[PDB]
Amino acid sequence: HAHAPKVIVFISGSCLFGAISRSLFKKLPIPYTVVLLILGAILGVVASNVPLVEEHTRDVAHMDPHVLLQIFLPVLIFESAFAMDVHTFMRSFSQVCILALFGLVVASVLTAVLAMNLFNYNWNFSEAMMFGAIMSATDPVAVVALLKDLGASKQLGTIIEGESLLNDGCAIVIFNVFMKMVFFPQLTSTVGQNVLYFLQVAVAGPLWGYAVAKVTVFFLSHIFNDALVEITITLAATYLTYYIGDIWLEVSGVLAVVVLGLIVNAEKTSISPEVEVFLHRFWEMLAYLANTLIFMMVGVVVTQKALVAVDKMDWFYLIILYLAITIIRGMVISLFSPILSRIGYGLTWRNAVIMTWGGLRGAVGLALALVVENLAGNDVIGSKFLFHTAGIVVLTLVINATTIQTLLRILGMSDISIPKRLAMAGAVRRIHEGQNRTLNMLKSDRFLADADWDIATAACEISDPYSPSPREFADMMEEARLRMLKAEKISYWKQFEHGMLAREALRLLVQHAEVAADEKDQFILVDDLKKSWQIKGIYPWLKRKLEDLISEKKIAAIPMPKYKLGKLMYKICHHMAFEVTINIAIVLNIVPIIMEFVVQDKMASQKIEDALRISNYVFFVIYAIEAIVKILGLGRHYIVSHWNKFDAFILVVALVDIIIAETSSIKVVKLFRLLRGLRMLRLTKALIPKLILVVNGKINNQLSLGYDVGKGYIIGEEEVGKIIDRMVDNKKILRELKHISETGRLQVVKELGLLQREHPGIAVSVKTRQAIRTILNHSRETIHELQGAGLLDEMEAHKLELTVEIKMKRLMNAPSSIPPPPPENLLKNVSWLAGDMKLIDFIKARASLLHFDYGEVIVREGDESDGLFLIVSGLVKLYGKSVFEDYLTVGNVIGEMGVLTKKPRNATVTCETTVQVYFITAEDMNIAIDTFTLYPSLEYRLWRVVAIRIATPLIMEQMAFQGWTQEKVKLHLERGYLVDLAESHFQFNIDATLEDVILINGTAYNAHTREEIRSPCLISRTVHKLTFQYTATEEPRLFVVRNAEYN
Structure with a gap:
């Protein structure tokens, strides 16, 4: 009927035009988005003459600005953020920020001055700054796509992407600031008032985004089977963050969404993997829809309203503007090149050109232009804003986006390295061989003997897409070095494929191998890997200091009261329910503290202020009974703890001000300020444990990465060492290589063994997390093996595989710190004791815990094998001639072979730290061996x-x-x-x-x-x-x- 939504045809039609352009112009270098502008222009000219079409484009063409910003920009900004490689982004965060924030300011200001002076539009500074802001918002999606494959991908690709993200986020902030000064001016503004305005947009926005992000990932980590709920939560968080930010809190929405995107991206582990792959394709689709609409909208309104007010001079200005913004970006990059070269990954002169030439303009610039074209109404400023912004988009997408492919060639960045060429050639050759075997196997089949093989072979053809003398000695050494480093890279990839390494550790190790391959006479240096497991000094200090605050050992020393009257209370004083109730009471006290005091401020509603006074009585009563119970339970020892004395002060305040208030304005403000300032602060006692947990989490994330890199390196070296034995011929070279590998392995196994001693609990948490993850992975495999064999039905297999998925999700919620089990628990868990309670008791009764100091020698070479040691704490260094060194840590048991073969000890054990060992005598073991002889015999x-x-x-x-x-x-x-x-x-x-x-x-x-x-x-x-x-x-x-x- 006449009320039918006519935006459905425009939106859907835009999708069809997008598909057509994206398909036909796939091969041509001209990006499809340019074609969309042409189609929009055609719709515009035809719409002006055919009133029927105009009725369908009006609702979307003439669209309110706010609805334009509120709906599209959060999609564009979030999608851009959600698609970044955050880890690399962080490691180059400073380099991006210097070039994005400061670079944006200078680039826009210089453009503004140009607009004021060059153009004869007689714009003031505010309008010129709007112009510069919309002219400095980039969109390099087409360029980062190329950089993703050809070369310089790891660093350059993300730097331009991150710089574009941040300059898009900030350009909208600057545009918002200067748009109000042009279309919604205010009569006055004070310096302090403006400073608060800066804090809201620049500081409060990111904090709002961070808060919403941390709340979101919390819930996502606690949703286990509902994928729809996860997707919907992501959508709702993205849109409410923007809406509440801009409209209710007036903080910068775009920056809030930028932070929200980055945090949720970093915390992907909290999202079930199947949902993660969906979201990436989901937000890509939403951004693609946003781009298609904005470009067609611009194509429409630019012809209907803009081109009718374009003079011959304006075309001249567009060219000059395009040249200016190009050289301005290069000048900004060069000017900061001295600074950027000393941080992150320094910009080479060729990289700088890519960034300068690759600064494509796009949707965000256009979207902001439409706002001005709408707010300006009939003023020419609206038309000329849209004209130039559209012109620059077309020019950049025609000139820059097409020639970048050739520029990357001229600069010699598209060359494929010899290793990649060789690997691809080998893979293709192997595939080509694999098909011939399959092809022959089919030709023997009786049911396929009549197939047309001329067609089959032609269709299944995979094609390579890329088409003693010192001089002698050094040559082999370089060959061996490279043949070693290549082997390592493989061994890291193999570990990843089998779920032994987290992606981050893999990336670090492969990056170090690649770097070493480029340098001369360079192997992997552990000193470079150390940065992975070096805990930043702040966190251990924070953990220690915070744990001191809530130590409360002086309360634990308080004895039971000496008479029954206090004995009952003492029990209550140590029941968690008591503290939980007091905390809930305190937090509920916020409601009066805010409501009554804000109501009184507004009055400065009398019945409300008169009524809420009684709630003060109620909370006073609650706190009074709390204090009475605590004093009765503890008695005179109550005053010992500093936290208690603060509550005593609070009750003093309550008595004094409730009496005086009932009895000038100073009394009332004293009551309000004192109640508010003190009674809320006693929540910190319960808060501090949460801060400790957060700190543990931050340490755990670092220590876990350290173990992966350290343990990944050790396994890689161990695997390679047994390969080079047959990969190189010269013994001298072979011996030199293995020496380096061992001197690296020893450092890693030592340093990585000292971390466990510094953070016992966190180490146990990290390790138990690895243990569970490994068990579940191989537990998943058996399900595939059973499913593949048909021994288990598909639907039943999936039902089991879910329980594994939820179990692997609950790991991320496991405590960041597990208290290290006591020594007796270790004996219970020795490989050859588990499950044999009768044996455990026998050993536990005869195992004697010994304590050694630094440097002591537990056992020495040639000593009779008098027993075996279980290291319950510390780190020991073994140095045996049967030259051969090693470091053993908690859990490892020394001398297992000695008691069996009764042969003298093979290595000397020295303590690198204060060591504790459960020593079981050889005589005891022999008795155990003789007395425990069921089928799983101890022997x-x-x-x-x-x-x-x-x-x-x-x-x-x-x-x-x-x-x-x-x-x-x-x-x-x-x-x-x-x-x-x-x-x-x-x-x-x-x-x-x-x-x-x-x-x-x-x-x-x-x-x-x-x-x-x-x-x-x-x-x-x-x-x-x-x-x-x-x-x-x-x-x-x-x-x-x-x-x-x-x-």
Whole structure:
């Protein structure tokens, strides 16, 4: 009917035009957005002549400014923020801010002066500043897209993107400031009044955004199965942050959304992964809709209202303006180049050109132009604002956006590095080989013999998109160095693919490897990695100081009252419900404190101020009973704590002012100010624990990243060290490489072991978090394995896989600090004790806790193996000639092999810190071995623990070249078991059911050749059968792993 929404046809039609442009002009260098402007112009000219069409474009063309800003800008700004690589953005935050904020001011002011002097429009400074503001809002989406692939992607790409984000955010702020001075002027403004205005837009805005962000991520972390709720919460937070910010709080909405976008982006872990991928594609779609509409709207109104008021001179000014804003941006970048070069990633002269040429203008500039074109009404200023802004957008998108592709070439930035070319060629060649095998396999199929292979081969063709002498010695060294660093990069990627590394640690390690590859004679330096696990000094100090404030040890020392009258209260005094009730009462006291006092201020409603006085009586009564109960429970010791004395002062205030108030204006203001100022501050007692939790969280986030980088490096080095043994020939080179790897590994394992001592609880939290995450991951795999085998139905598989998903989400809410378990708990958790309560009691009764000081030697080489140590606290350094060094920390048990083979100790143990060890004597272990002999025998368990640790190096060395990482090998061995040579004193291999057989201890004879095999050897696949000697000196033990099919 006549009331039908006519914006539906325009909005939907805009989508179709966007699709058409985006499709047809996909290959041409001209960006599609230019075509949208042409189509908008066509709609404008045709609309002016055909009244029917005008009825459909009017509602959206002639659209109120506020509705333009309130709906579109939050989408554009949030989407831009939500799409950033925050981690890189933060690491270059200063460099972006200097160039964005200060650069924006100078760029706009210089443009403003140009507009005033050059143009004959006779604009004043306010209008010229609006012009400069809308002329300095960039939109480099087309340029960062190219930089994403070709080169210089990591640093340059995000710097231009972040700079554009911040200058867009600030340009709107400047535009808002100067628009009110032009279209909504005010009679007067004081200096102090303006300063408060600055604080609101510049300081309060970001704080409002930060508060809403931290509230949002809190709830998102507590939504477990509703994806729709997560998406809706994101939408509502984004729009309410802007609306409440601009309209109710009058703080800067755009900056609030910028901060909200960045915080929510950083806290992506709080969003379920499946939702995360949705949101990225969702906000992209919303931003794409916003761009398509704004460009078509400009195309419409520019022809209907703007081009009718354009003189020949205006065209001349547009060219001069385009040249000016281009050289101005370059001047700003160069001028700050000395500063920017000394922070973050310094700008090379070629990078500067990219930033200068890549400063495309776009939607935000146009959107703000439409506001002026609307507010100005019939004034020419509106038309000429829209004309120039549209002109600059067209010129930049025609000239800059098309030639940037060639400029990146001329500057020699698009070249693909040799490593990438080689990797792509190898991958393509392997794929090409993979298809030939598949193609042959199909040709043998009876049901596909008649298929047209000429077409099949042509269709499935993947094509490469990119198409002793010192001089001798140094050459191999450079070759080896690069062949090593390349291996590491692989080992990091393998770890990530198997969920062993967080993405951030992977990025750091790969970045360091790449940097080392570019430099000369450079390997990975741990000194560069240290920045990952160095805790900033502020946080430990804050944690210590805050924990001192609520120490309250002087209350814990208070004894029970000496008579029954106080005994009952004392119990209440230590019930959490008491403190919770008092806190709730206090926080409820805000309602009177605000309502009555603000009402009295307004009067300065008498019945309200008369009535609320009674609530003061009620809260006084509550606090009085609280004080009475506390004094009765504690007695004279009550006054000891400083927190209590503050409450005594508060009650003194209550008595004094409630009496005096009931009994000039000074008394009333005294009552109000004193009640408000004091009674709210006693919440800090309950607040401080939350601050401690926040601090823990900040430390945990840093320490966790440290462990990943440190542990990622160690595993990478361990894997590589068994590869270079066969990747390089020259022994001298080989020896030099491994020496560096070990001197790096020792530093990492030491420093990373000292952090645990500095922050015990946080370390335990981090580690238990890793433990759970690993368990769930491999728990997820079995579900896929069961699903893939068809052994479990798809719907049932999904039902299980949900419980894993919610479980992995609840990790993020786990406490940042777990109190370290006491020593007795460690014994309970030793690998070869778990579950055997009878054995645990036997050991716990005979384990003697010892304490050592720095530098003491627990055991020395050649000493008889008198027992084994479990390190419950500290860090010990092992230095054994069978040269070979290591550092062991909490949990690790020393001497497991010694008590079994009864052979002298292999390494000297020195304490790097104050160490505590549970010492179990060899005699006790022998007794335990003799007295605990069920199927999972203690001797069997001990050997199994040792066996795997001995086996893992052998299997790695034998199959490092293949695709298995360490975790896979260790799990692989986990399926194994030790054979009882008493059940059969000879072992017969079965190649179809035994995957690997390892000899751990004792000599074994080849049954046919009667060759003797040394103890730690990995039995070669060629051996058919083994015969074992029987001597007391070395009883032979053997480890085997069967195929999945149980024998």
